[PDB]
Amino acid sequence: SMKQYVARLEKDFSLIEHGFKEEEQRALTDYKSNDGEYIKKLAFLAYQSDVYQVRMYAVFLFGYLSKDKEILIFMRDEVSKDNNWRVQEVLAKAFDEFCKKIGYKKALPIIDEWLKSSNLHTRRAATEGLRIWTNRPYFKENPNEAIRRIADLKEDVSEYVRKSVGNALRDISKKFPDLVKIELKNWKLESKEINQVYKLASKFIDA
Numbered sequence: 356s357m358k359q360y361v362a363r364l365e366k367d368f369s370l371i372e373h374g375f376k377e378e379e380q381r382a383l384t385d386y387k388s389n390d391g392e393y394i395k396k397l398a399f400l401a402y403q404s405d406v407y408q409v410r411m412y413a414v415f416l417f418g419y420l421s422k423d424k425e426i427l428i429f430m431r432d433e434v435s436k437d438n439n440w441r442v443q444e445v446l447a448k449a450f451d452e453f454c455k456k457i458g459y460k461k462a463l464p465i466i467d468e469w470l471k472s473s474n475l476h477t478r479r480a481a482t483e484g485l486r487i488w489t490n491r492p493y494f495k496e497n498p499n500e501a502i503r504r505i506a507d508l509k510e511d512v513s514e515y516v517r518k519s520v521g522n523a524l525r526d527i528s529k530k531f532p533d534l535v536k537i538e539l540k541n542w543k544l545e546s547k548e549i550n551q552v553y554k555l556a557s558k559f560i561d562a
């Protein structure tokens with residue numbers, strides 16, 4: 356029956372070539388209408404699908420279920436291995452969902468853990484998923500707590516991470532130009548990595 360339901364999701368979703376709202380809405384409905392211990396089993400089974408759109412659905416479920424530390428660890432360490440970039444985009448959204456549910460201030464230790472993780476996809480999920488960082492609670496009132504955390508990744512080894520880092524600072528610069536200017540002025544523009552991030556972050560700054 357659970358297997359039958361995964362088979363129905365595969366039929367429903369496998370031909371979708373763009374977007375994520377259909378998978379998201381189905382996950383939200385299923386999360387709200389069933390007990391969490393059952394939905395955890397469904398999420399793990401769906402995440403094993405060879406249909407990446409069903410894995411997207413499963414990762415939305417993980418986000419809704421992420422108060423359970425075992426689900427959050429599976430997101431951090433296993434979903435981050437997914438070879439499909441659309442699933443990676445859903446991982447970022449599911450991480451934002453975790454932070455929204457617990458509260459952004461209460462989530463800071465987990466944010467910091469993901470930003471320091473060994474898997475570049477874990478680091479990127481946190482940097483990208485919270486964009487625009489200063490539109491979220493806590494960061495909106497404390498913008499330097501976002502700027503400092505993002506700027507710490509300006510030397511990241513991964514280009515995928517660095518693009519998210521630079522664009523996350525670019526977002527913030529449009530509403531907090533004074534604070535981003537102060538941060539950028541302190542950078543020593545030596546490495547290839549930091550120069551890539553600096554160019555993205557500085558477009559709207561009168562340096």
Ligand SMILES: O=c1[nH]cnc2c1ncn2[C@@H]1O[C@H](COP(=O)(O)O)[C@@H](O)[C@H]1O
Pocket residue numbers: 372373374375440
């Ligand atoms: O790794 C990627 N490969 C291809 N497109 C990507 C990738 N990462 C982000 N995108 C882009 O993200 C966007 C997703 O929009 P969608 O196709 O309407 O769902 C597309 O422009 C994609 O080209």
Ligand SMILES: [Cl-]
Pocket residue numbers: 486487488490
């Ligand atoms: Cl936003």
